[PDB]
Amino acid sequence: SEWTERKTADGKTYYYNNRTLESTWEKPQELK
Numbered sequence: 022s023e024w025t026e027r028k029t030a031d032g033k034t035y036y037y038n039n040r041t042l043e044s045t046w047e048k049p050q051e052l053k
Contacts (some may be wrong), residue, residue, distance in 0.1 A: 025050045 024032065024036040036052070037044040 022053055024049060 023040065023042045026034060026036050028034045033046060035044050035046055036049065
């Protein structure tokens with residue numbers, strides 16, 4: 022649940038996490 026799924030009106034759902042400072046714009050399976 023540690024990934025931030027933020028649905029912005031930019032027309033994109035980004036999953037930014039400080040784990041790697043990475044943003045996964047494709048939905049990870051290890052998101053839990």
